[PDB]
Symmetry: D4
Subunit: 181 residues, 8 copies
Amino acid sequence: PRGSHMEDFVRQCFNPMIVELAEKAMKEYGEDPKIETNKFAATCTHLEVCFMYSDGGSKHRFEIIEGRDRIMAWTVVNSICNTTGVEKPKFLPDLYDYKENRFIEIGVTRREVHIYYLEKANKIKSEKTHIHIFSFTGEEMATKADYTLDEESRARIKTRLFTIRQEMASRSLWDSFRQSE
Amino acid sequence: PRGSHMEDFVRQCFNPMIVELAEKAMKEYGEDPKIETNKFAATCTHLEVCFMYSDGGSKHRFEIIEGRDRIMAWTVVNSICNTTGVEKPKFLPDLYDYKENRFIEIGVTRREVHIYYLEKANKIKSEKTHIHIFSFTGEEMATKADYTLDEESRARIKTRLFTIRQEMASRSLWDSFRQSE
Amino acid sequence: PRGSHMEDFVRQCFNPMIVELAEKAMKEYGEDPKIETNKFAATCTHLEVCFMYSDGGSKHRFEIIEGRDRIMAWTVVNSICNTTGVEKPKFLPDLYDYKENRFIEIGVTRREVHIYYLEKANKIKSEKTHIHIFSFTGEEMATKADYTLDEESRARIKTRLFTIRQEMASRSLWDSFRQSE
Amino acid sequence: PRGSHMEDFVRQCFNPMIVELAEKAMKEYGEDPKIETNKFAATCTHLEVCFMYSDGGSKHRFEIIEGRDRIMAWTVVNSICNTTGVEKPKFLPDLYDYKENRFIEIGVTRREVHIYYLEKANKIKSEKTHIHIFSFTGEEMATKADYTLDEESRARIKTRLFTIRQEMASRSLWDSFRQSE
Amino acid sequence: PRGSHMEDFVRQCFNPMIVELAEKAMKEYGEDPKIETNKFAATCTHLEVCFMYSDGGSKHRFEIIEGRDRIMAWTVVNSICNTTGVEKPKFLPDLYDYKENRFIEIGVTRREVHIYYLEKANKIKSEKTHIHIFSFTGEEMATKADYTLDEESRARIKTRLFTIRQEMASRSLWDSFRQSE
Amino acid sequence: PRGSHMEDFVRQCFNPMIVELAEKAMKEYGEDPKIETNKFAATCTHLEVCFMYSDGGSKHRFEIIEGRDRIMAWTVVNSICNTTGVEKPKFLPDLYDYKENRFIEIGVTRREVHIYYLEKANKIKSEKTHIHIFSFTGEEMATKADYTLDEESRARIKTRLFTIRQEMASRSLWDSFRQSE
Amino acid sequence: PRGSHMEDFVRQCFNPMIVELAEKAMKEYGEDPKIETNKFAATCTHLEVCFMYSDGGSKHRFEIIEGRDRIMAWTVVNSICNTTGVEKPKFLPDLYDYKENRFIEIGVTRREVHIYYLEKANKIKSEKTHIHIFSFTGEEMATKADYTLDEESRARIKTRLFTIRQEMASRSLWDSFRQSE
Amino acid sequence: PRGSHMEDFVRQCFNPMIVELAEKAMKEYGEDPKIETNKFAATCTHLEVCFMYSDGGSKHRFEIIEGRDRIMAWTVVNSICNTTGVEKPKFLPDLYDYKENRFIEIGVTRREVHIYYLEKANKIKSEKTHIHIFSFTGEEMATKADYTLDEESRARIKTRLFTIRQEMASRSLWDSFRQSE
Ligand SMILES: O=C1c2c(O)c(=O)ccn2N([C@@H]2c3ccccc3SCc3c2ccc(F)c3F)[C@@H]2COCCN12
Ligand SMILES: O=C1c2c(O)c(=O)ccn2N([C@@H]2c3ccccc3SCc3c2ccc(F)c3F)[C@@H]2COCCN12
Ligand SMILES: O=C1c2c(O)c(=O)ccn2N([C@@H]2c3ccccc3SCc3c2ccc(F)c3F)[C@@H]2COCCN12
Ligand SMILES: O=C1c2c(O)c(=O)ccn2N([C@@H]2c3ccccc3SCc3c2ccc(F)c3F)[C@@H]2COCCN12
Ligand SMILES: O=C1c2c(O)c(=O)ccn2N([C@@H]2c3ccccc3SCc3c2ccc(F)c3F)[C@@H]2COCCN12
Ligand SMILES: O=C1c2c(O)c(=O)ccn2N([C@@H]2c3ccccc3SCc3c2ccc(F)c3F)[C@@H]2COCCN12
Ligand SMILES: O=C1c2c(O)c(=O)ccn2N([C@@H]2c3ccccc3SCc3c2ccc(F)c3F)[C@@H]2COCCN12
Ligand SMILES: O=C1c2c(O)c(=O)ccn2N([C@@H]2c3ccccc3SCc3c2ccc(F)c3F)[C@@H]2COCCN12
Ligand SMILES: [Mn+2]
Ligand SMILES: [Mn+2]
Ligand SMILES: [Mn+2]
Ligand SMILES: [Mn+2]
Ligand SMILES: [Mn+2]
Ligand SMILES: [Mn+2]
Ligand SMILES: [Mn+2]
Ligand SMILES: [Mn+2]
Ligand SMILES: [Mn+2]
Ligand SMILES: [Mn+2]
Ligand SMILES: [Mn+2]
Ligand SMILES: [Mn+2]
Ligand SMILES: [Mn+2]
Ligand SMILES: [Mn+2]
Ligand SMILES: [Mn+2]
Ligand SMILES: [Mn+2]
């Protein structure tokens, strides 16, 4: 047994569906949520942001790729590629935008948004995949200064992120989380 | 007992409400889902596309004729005809469009959309009934190049169709399904 | 016991919430649904039309007065009058339109819409109350040729009304219902 | 035991979620709903108005601060301030408007709206916090004559307030409630 | 409007299903729950006791006659009589005991149980109908000193009755209720 | 369209799960509930009696064979036979009794129970299958005078049957139902 | 903000209904669950044990006094006393046993059961109130060596208590909890 | 992708809760349900049998150890051992019997029950752990000829097992499943 304070916080911070999907994702890659508790908190956070993000558009606008098992995520990507003609990305994206006709990679970072976007931009070769970074201090950075959603939908995310930061802080979990990325 | 791999795939591929409605439809016409398993898969697919399609418009836009028992489908058609003045079609359509004021026949084909539309166009005498064909490779073809719904709503359908194709393929069921139309 | 075929049809034709509200309305006025079965069918129909009607606008557009007990319906009317300055009507209306700022009296008739509107127009003294008649043959007639809702929302109602007519007919209940108004 | 007629009216007037949230709020400040029954009725009313108010905008428009425990309300305020740059208010507001980028203090008064707005305006130092007063007679008063929501959304609130007034009156509870502010 | 304190207490004292069934019962006999508020409280109480009583036996032991519309209550009585050979009672009973093979009339009184049993015993001619009286002070009296249920099941009822008495008292409603029988 | 009064009565008499299972059973054998309305009423009745019957024993006592598709009913029979050693019956039974270790054929008749039991006894060759007949007048007849369940569980069934008889009668449907067996 | 590891553990250890009832109980006595976190854990534990305990008897055996607001707990006690003749206890008990006709005070201790029973026995003057102590190491001690429930029902409680002990230990919360009584 | 016919059968054969728990169990041990499809079918079967088994006793009789994550299963075992004094087993058991005070290891085999019991008996050192083997042909074998449950509860399991065998057979999956143990 590990008995982590972070694990208990994550289960009280996030809704059960988010917790369960992150748990399953971590296991698919051979990570244990009871040990890699910072990663447990990060994947739950990233998932909520993706779900909040997809809720921001018009109905039917987004295809959610994140939150699926590896095989099924790539299946939906293939159907999207084979029906829209977009090139198949080399790395799994997070969403697909049926309005702008491009995949979206979403990032959540405890560092400056500019340095995380650099990393993801270099990692992904598919220059077509749109990148959108959010930070725990309320900054965001998006490819071509195109932020996809309107201001209010993005502001919700930023507010939620800062609330998770505080909840972590009041429990003395933030410092360990911050210096873990 | 038949014990079909396709039957089990259909029950895991489609949601129970779709499965049940297709089962009932097939029986109304004296077909057994446990034997005519390709038809089982086709009617479930066609139904989902119709439901996805009707979800694409503004609220109240569409009347769903598909997914009802024969007698009740013709009842709703009669009320539609007797209240809008449109001519009564000779063959049951799939939807009615209260915005464009016309019935819609929806088709899903494993062949080239152009050859399936030809068949349906000649079968139906009511030239007023709007035709919309979708293919399992992402093509679509609609009467008068009028596609009724906006791009994103149609792209969802095309993506879903290609996902069913893949799911069938990974189980070695696609070839039998394709060469069955 | 009465054991009416119409009573059983009404309970299978309408959803339980509509049936229950009409039953309660009829009793409040000292009418028995098991005897006055035509009135049972009429009040259920009128209620569904009112609910369909109120679903036709933008969110928050309509206040539903029908489907409440007498005392509470007049309470909501008073609050509406005392907050919008509109004159208090002499007879209970069916809805209030927050967009057009007027009460709506809704009518459903088995006769020509023009003769039913005449009756309601003369009955109500409050010339401000907007009148909207629907018929079982798909006609409608509204004060000042102002039909409040857009075409599709009204077409749904007309289709539903003609479907109830048919359902009644196939059971040989229509003739008795028609020649009862 | 107190056995208040007002307490029983409040539990039949408001929905359980509203009652429960007000009960919890009152206790957090060391007030007993079974004794301070006018305050019980007021906080339930204020809460419903806030929830009705937040339902009036576009989706994602408002952040609801009211209806949370003290510590969590200030947490969401901090995240809002730390992500939008708005100054942190000295007193807890009721909502945040992501469209207009300002906090909203909502007031419900049994006096003239003009005298209650004066009080709240002087109490709060943060001149940025938008003030919106509703009265039990259907008047409203908002900072800069900017009423945030469109007419119909505000008219619903005014109607609901006058309905609570009547419900109180028919039980001879209004006079005590009015002369308690 | 009547605006009764008793009416509001009844809706907070009893569960909605009990309230609704009593309301419907009272209307079937041309009584208004908003005026005859003592009768409103009495019929709700009597109903709860009957339901508690029927929950006291083994599964399938009791047929609940109370809580049905007049016509259906007499229908179930007829089926019981026509299948068990028991004589048809002249007045509607409250339950039927499939173990002891007899109808049960249940009484709840604010007077001495002995004087209420006398009344019911003389009212009913069918000496076969078993009588069981409960009082608001915890006394009970049953035909032939046969109390049907075991002690604990009857003690629950007595406890619940005294709790309703107290709830009424703390609101100064008991005296009016007591001196109303 | 047929528009039967019996069809509407059946849908108001029986619970939706019973109606649906009977509908499906009738179709599996190529019968239409909208035409063979007496058979519709009979199969619903028989099903309810079987479900009531299986609810009469101790938990786990009965295996319900009725209410399944043909293929699955015979599957459960085979597992029962292949695990208890009982001989496989030639005709589908209604239940299996794990306490008495025998299949049960349940019958509901509008004639004298003695003449219906004769028919079923001669039809079935498996003398091991226990027979239990119920009548619409409250009589019952069981193999070897062994009635499996205790008195109260059987009395419920008899009461329910006579209630269906009355409900049919008050609608002038009984005579046609009776003279149809 | 306090941000306690114990608080988060309690919300993941106990079911929401238990957490909520304990939170409300603590506030009624002017204790904050966010600060007095050991008491938060203790009251949740005690509540679960009481609910498990009451689930151990026959149906209707126990009246649950714990888990109610102070005023209502004493109301049910009064009805119990005024209907069974038992003397009214000076301190709120946890249950009432309708079979043995006595109140039960339940205790959960981190010390030797014998020393906690001594304390409760001296605190309560009503020698009639039955005492039942459980320990976190699986010991129990009951008045007159009468343990009310059968062995299996008590063993469940003991197992659950030791599981909470372990869950606390694996998080390094046990030592602080133990040395807090 | 694997696309197994067995995988699809398992998801249609077992209820979602059973499927999900087995999936999670298999992953905890580094097995993939999409590849080890026979093991997928076996663990689902074993789980259902355990749940059926635990449903066979009196309420509170059994503690279910199977169907939990490794760490929590051993936690409940420790609490059971530390509260009943039973020796801690070396290998995780399936249940604990509070009536007979012993752990139960449940086995399901496609071979002769006698050879599987031999294996489990030698594997486990704790001679105290009670062993109960079920076969897919309806045989069972239990330690000391003590079968814990009464006949009917065990017969249900045997019937269910043979039904899974048939369902597998009709799909030509049985032979591969049988020759896999
Ligand atoms: O989708 C992602 C993913 C992102 O989309 C992302 O933005 C950042 C990081 N990711 N990774 C996520 C992840 C997601 C969110 C926060 C941290 C991590 S850290 C690695 C990891 C992930 C999932 C499970 C797991 F066990 C991991 F170790 C992996 C990269 O491989 C494709 C899926 N994926
Ligand atoms: O509505 C349709 C229908 C279509 O709308 C359609 O587009 C293609 C094909 N259809 N047919 C559907 C159907 C639907 C979808 C896929 C395949 C089939 S193949 C024949 C068949 C259908 C339904 C039940 C059944 F038993 C059948 F044999 C029948 C044609 O008679 C009117 C209803 N209908
Ligand atoms: O609101 C209506 C109402 C209408 O709004 C309406 O359009 C036509 C007719 N109405 N009446 C409805 C009614 C509604 C729909 C169809 C038929 C009837 S017929 C009389 C009656 C009604 C309700 C209960 C009852 F027992 C009745 F006898 C009464 C007129 O008194 C105010 C309420 N009300
Ligand atoms: O948010 C409010 C609040 C308002 O927003 C408001 O508009 C008027 C009045 N308020 N107060 C509310 C309140 C809200 C609605 C109606 C009356 C009261 S009267 C004092 C009181 C409140 C909450 C609990 C409690 F026990 C109280 F005594 C307190 C002021 O401290 C911050 C929270 N709050
Ligand atoms: O069943 C009862 C009934 C009893 O069973 C009973 O015990 C006492 C009294 N009853 N009556 C109940 C009733 C039940 C409980 C408490 C008070 C009353 S007072 C009259 C009344 C009743 C129902 C509706 C109504 F409008 C009434 F005026 C009527 C007597 O006519 C048959 C039904 N019924
Ligand atoms: O199980 C029964 C069955 C009985 O168990 C029974 O007792 C009487 C009669 N049965 N039959 C039932 C049935 C059941 C209840 C009332 C009438 C009927 S009449 C024929 C029929 C049945 C089912 C569907 C259908 F379309 C039918 F025409 C058929 C006999 O073939 C095996 C299944 N079955
Ligand atoms: O019922 C109990 C109670 C017990 O029944 C008990 O066994 C031990 C202790 N109790 N007390 C419980 C309690 C219950 C369980 C564990 C610790 C505590 S510690 C004090 C406290 C309690 C409740 C709220 C609160 F804020 C408290 F400070 C109070 C004693 O006043 C009557 C109610 N009550
Ligand atoms: O509990 C069991 C278990 C049994 O109880 C059992 O009876 C037979 C076999 N078991 N094993 C089960 C299992 C259960 C049912 C059918 C086959 C298997 S095969 C190995 C395996 C199991 C679980 C997950 C997994 F990935 C596995 F490879 C493992 C042995 O390690 C402790 C848990 N466990
Ligand atoms: Mn991703
Ligand atoms: Mn990402
Ligand atoms: Mn069609
Ligand atoms: Mn089509
Ligand atoms: Mn009206
Ligand atoms: Mn009208
Ligand atoms: Mn506020
Ligand atoms: Mn405010
Ligand atoms: Mn009665
Ligand atoms: Mn009575
Ligand atoms: Mn049968
Ligand atoms: Mn039969
Ligand atoms: Mn206590
Ligand atoms: Mn205690
Ligand atoms: Mn195991
Ligand atoms: Mn095992």
